Symmetry: C3
Subunit: 336 residues, 3 copies
């Protein structure tokens, strides 16, 4: 399209919501190509990531870790207004894996505190894609401080399975998984700092071990459990988008499956089916589609079970409905 | 189906055999749906995992690490009697990744020492699948203590390639790969403990490094070598099922290939072909099909070669038959 | 038959150093051939970072990685492998592309002062790792740089999942190397007189499963600056990537993998529109991209710690006209 043709396209302002929820959208596109507009203020803030009061100096797109899911359709334009407030201490930017050119946008969005920028790109490829901060020379530090999220570029005709039959979800959730590298002192206690820059040297040493101290969903241990469990009902079709900007993960729904899984995250690559545990490499997003068949509590984990149950990578689903004894029954309950 | 319909189905009791062998079965299902009955006693037992005499207090389903391969067909019911004898010290249970509901059966099979339970589930999805112990609060410890195995749910019509041609194996082996995390003293020598619980805190610290001390097939360094090498002949068709309940692996047949590989382990997902090295994520099983073409020794390995040759993840195949000079020949043997 | 193999033509090919690739055609020119290559193994001290860090490398043909060899399906690859008397160690070669004798390793064990000639039929199309594998010291040789890859093209060239031609304008081979360099108690990397002197110290580092360096073409920054790879807008590029010992996850920053044979095998249909692909330790993969935008790109292992702290980052410098439809700065950074 020409500059004039794009200027004539309809504009739609989207209001982002905090993960794991996803802003309102249509699966099948409602009309022709649009310029879909998003705004995000980058907030540098302390976050507490475990029950020992361990702190991270986060880079929080839109005030969350992960940053929110942005949803467009293929051949829409995504126009982001990105704002770095004067209260921040560092330069930041954004690299959309979904975009083409200038290091994903990173080369065009370097904004110091007190500045803002507007980037527009054409979402030419359908899929879920990571986005993340990437300041030259400081890239991994910003990403593992929580400066990452994802977007979903739906096909204009919605999702389909490998034979072209429609796949339509009732619910969608976004799980951002984060590897943290928190320095400790001589007695094994996690260190606290009063400024992001103060922890840099110490953090780089931990990162070089390639061994995260914490691996969490939605910014902290237990962030998606207890009261913040995701919900569904028997019969409901659910899409779980999962991202990891820096490090591999292997998602698994304990008690369920991935009926369809775009493990590469790309919708023109047909989905795998009947999956127990799928694999998303660092620097990517994937998506799984599941129809719940049984009520009760499910745990959704990175199935390196040390990472899930020692380091923090575990979420819950609470599911309502009728139990199915054909699928599963206790013939003899635990007894002497 | 209804409870009455299921009660009318024929039962068959299966005697399990120790890995890497697999109990007698038919590739193409005999008749209609059955309730296939297995019994497994859990044994907490000391095992020796290397040639120095390093020992682990294992949780051994049916007395082995890994637990044995159970084989059924799609839409059969798997009915497991699981027994925790009173000589054991801990509660155990079982999570079938093949099953749907109650955390894979885990929520319905918590048995203290002196107790037993019978769980039945419908095997609705075809593939190979991990099973493992998963007691709330103690999940990874039980799994990395060897409390895991796999099942195979064959399609009722046996295996096929991605395009409808039958794939019929002459023999099958099950390779269970185990990451162990054995505490060490100040001399770098592995510690021994009197009971399972005594090793807990020390073991958890090693687990947090995400760096196993040992990575082994069939419970020990060298377990599938020497006179315990797997065997085949030129022309023979072999399926190798490979599981890893906690941690990634990358199987490779040195001198061979995976002609067809269900790397996700799921038979409705078409197999990759002509593979050098395939990839199975932690928490999953995979399967590879190969027709041997050359005689001699092969090594089957996790192709992180440090993991294979330093940590223990190497097995051998001994293959009988005639050398094929068309496929490979030494034009000039090593000479001055 | 026997007479027929003996009657097949023999063609010698001159190798070139990575990331460049020797002369070849995408569609096979003629019928099956015996393609002959020669490689001398060089044990040499190489410098892998900006602080003068040394490794005693095993360098097939004098490079880390060893060079890319390119044949077509059902050609034979006939390698002459030479281990000069100035070397201290036995070496050999295992072609993942080959069938039999541990990939050739059982037939190619050459002491210093010896050579050997191995021939194998390239029956399976794809990119494949090769590496040294002396029994009992396999990982040491591989993580000392003793590895490369080959490409076995389909006789009819590359195709997408639907059967239409994919023809590249150029090809690069990126070999990625995990190194495990011992450090003294002060945190400084150690140097050794001879390869064997480092064995014990190196195996201890290997057992951490934590590389001190992860690099492309044998050193930090080997494919950056004046050594960046090049392309132009409109050009179709194939990037072959190998890792003989450890997982990697390639990503073209600012681009994509339009078609990616992530397993490296051409009979397995390529994934499409990839952001970041995955190649397991012990394999090669291949990505095809058509460049749409000019400028500098970084090509990385997208564990960004591995890329930017440990060394796994390369550059492409791309010429041509910018496309404001695909991307534009509506408002540049401003107060
Ligand atoms: Cu930032
Ligand atoms: Cu990136
Ligand atoms: Cu247990
Ligand atoms: Cu599990
Ligand atoms: Cu060597
Ligand atoms: Cu190999």
């Amino acid at each position: 399209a020409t500059a004039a043709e794009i200027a004539a396209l309809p504009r739609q302002k989207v209001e982002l919501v905090d993960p794991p929820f996803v802003h309102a959208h249509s699966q099948v596109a409602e009309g022709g190509p649009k310029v879909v507009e998003f705004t995000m203020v980058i907030e540098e803030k302390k976050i507490v990531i475990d029950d020992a009061g361990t702190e991270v100096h986060a880079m929080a797109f839109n005030g969350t870790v992960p940053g929110p899911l942005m949803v467009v359709h293929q051949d829409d334009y995504l126009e982001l207004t990105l704002i770095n407030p004067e209260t921040n201490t560092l330069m930041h930017n954004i690299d959309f894996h979904a975009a083409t050119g200038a290091l994903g946008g990173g080369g065009l969005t370097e904004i110091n505190p007190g500045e803002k920028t507007i980037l527009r790109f054409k979402a030419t490829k359908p899929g879920v894609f990571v986005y993340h901060c990437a300041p030259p020379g400081m890239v991994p530090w910003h990403v593992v401080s929580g400066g990452n999220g994802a977007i979903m570029v739906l096909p204009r005709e919605g999702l389909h399975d490998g034979k072209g039959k429609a796949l339509t979800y009732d619910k969608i959730y976004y799980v951002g998984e984060q590897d943290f590298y928190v320095p400790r002192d001589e007695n094994g206690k996690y260190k606290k700092y009063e400024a992001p820059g103060d922890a840099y040297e110490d953090t780089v040493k931990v990162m070089r071990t390639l061994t995260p101290t914490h691996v969490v969903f939605n910014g902290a241990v237990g962030a998606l459990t207890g009261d913040k469990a995701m919900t569904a009902a028997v019969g409901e079709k659910v899409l779980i988008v999962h991202s990891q900007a820096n490090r591999d993960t292997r998602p698994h729904l304990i008690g369920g499956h991935g009926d369809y899984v775009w493990a590469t995250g790309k919708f023109n690559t047909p989905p795998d089916v009947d999956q127990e545990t799928w694999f998303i490499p660092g620097g990517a997003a994937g998506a799984a589609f599941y129809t719940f068949q049984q009520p009760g509590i499910y745990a959704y984990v990175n199935h390196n079970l040390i990472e899930a149950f020692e380091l923090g990578a575990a979420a819950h689903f609470k599911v309502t409905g009728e139990w199915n004894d054909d699928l599963m029954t206790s013939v003899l309950a635990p007894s002497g």
